[PDB]
Amino acid sequence: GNFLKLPDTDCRQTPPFLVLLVTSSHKQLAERMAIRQTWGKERMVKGKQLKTFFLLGTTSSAAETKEVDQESQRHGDIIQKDFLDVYYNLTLKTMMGIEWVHRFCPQAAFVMKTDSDMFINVDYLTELLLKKNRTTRFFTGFLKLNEFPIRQPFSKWFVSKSEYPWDRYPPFCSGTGYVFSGDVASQVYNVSKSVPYIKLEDVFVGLCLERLNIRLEELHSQPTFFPGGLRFSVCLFRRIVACHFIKPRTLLDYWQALENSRGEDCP
Ligand SMILES: *[C@@H]1O[C@H](CO)[C@@H](O[C@@H]2O[C@H](CO)[C@@H](O)[C@H](O)[C@H]2NC(C)=O)[C@H](O)[C@H]1NC(C)=O
Ligand SMILES: O=c1ccn([C@@H]2O[C@H](COP(=O)(O)OP(=O)(O)O)[C@@H](O)[C@H]2O)c(=O)[nH]1
Ligand SMILES: *[C@@H]1O[C@H](CO[C@@H]2O[C@@H](C)[C@@H](O)[C@@H](O)[C@@H]2O)[C@@H](O)[C@H](O)[C@H]1NC(C)=O
Ligand SMILES: [Mn+2]
């Protein structure tokens, strides 16, 4: 599928239970390292394999290119295709990850597309997935069901009426972090080229899901995805899946906190 970089993995020999696909720009090496030492550390969670890969495009900068090439050689966890890695190309990045799942890891039980400014509790997510008994046509996260396109011309998320001509967006989940059974990736890739393009990646996935008649489901009876951020407590982060607004230094302090407090019980 025209991939410049592929992770050294074989999902047929060892079918992963959860695959994390993380978006980060080239210069965000600090974010990728913090994730690699924290929630992205590959391991067995309740006997289920967790794999973590980073989605990258390409950049004009030769320096950055070299750096990333070196990182791929040292880590072997980068998925890359030739597309200008900018905020308005995140739909290409997301479709790149979905294509990678479809071509090289269709065996994954579940896939999580996440951003790099985030805390992910994989242990609580794995537990909640094994309790849902939903292994096909499954898609969850922070559900956004009546969103209106931003028409403020200078907003980061402005879309003109030519880019998106309708009053409302389809049902979708925040791109901060969404999870789907591995089969959905193949369906989204197959229908992607026939769905009207939009530069907001989570909206675009929503348009595809709408085309495929796959409905959005809440993961749990309590909220577990927090795109707005949360006040930190070891007890709260033990009972959530994802939290946004987390810079790298903060991610390491939180992981040290949960590591320092393992063994303590919580109200
Ligand atoms: C997203 O990435 C694509 C692919 O790199 C960009 O399209 C190319 O843009 C470069 C310069 O930006 C041109 O030299 C090429 O002719 C374009 N090729 C293709 C395949 O279209 C595109 O511009 C990027 N989008 C944004 C918003 O920057
Ligand atoms: O050129 C870019 C810019 C951003 N991102 C990633 O896209 C996500 C969204 O960017 P940001 O967090 O700045 O936006 P917001 O949270 O405001 O939507 C983050 O994981 C970034 O690392 C990326 O992969 N390439
Ligand atoms: C998932 O399934 C768990 C156990 O399996 C169930 O046991 C049999 C006897 C039937 O009750 C059948 O529904 C299941 O296969 C349940 O404990 C659990 O509640 C289920 N999850 C949900 C949210 O329904
Ligand atoms: Mn963000």
From Swiss-Prot:
It comes from the Eukaryota. Its EC number is 2.4.1.-. InterPro entries: Glyco_trans_31 (IPR002659). Residues 1-267 are lumenal. One of its GO terms (biological process) is response to bacterium. It catalyses: a globoside Gb4Cer (d18:1(4E)) + UDP-alpha-D-galactose = a globoside GalGb4Cer (d18:1(4E)) + UDP + H(+). Glycans are attached at N89, N133, N190. Keywords: Glycoprotein, Glycosyltransferase, Golgi apparatus, Lipid metabolism, Membrane, Signal-anchor, Transferase, Transmembrane, Transmembrane helix. Expressed in stomach, jejunum, colon, pancreas, small intestine, testis and gastrointestinal and pancreatic cancer cell lines. Hardly detected in lung, liver, adrenal gland and peripheral blood leukocytes. It is an enzyme of class 2 (transferase). Pathway: Protein modification; protein glycosylation. It is a single-pass type II membrane protein. GO terms for cellular component: endoplasmic reticulum; Golgi apparatus; Golgi membrane. It is found in: Golgi apparatus membrane. One of its GO terms (molecular function) is N-acetyl-beta-D-glucosaminide beta-(1,3)-galactosyltransferase activity. Catalyzes the transfer of Gal to GlcNAc-based acceptors with a preference for the core3 O-linked glycan GlcNAc(beta1,3)GalNAc structure. Can use glycolipid LC3Cer as an efficient acceptor. Belongs to the glycosyltransferase 31 family. This is Beta-1,3-galactosyltransferase 5.
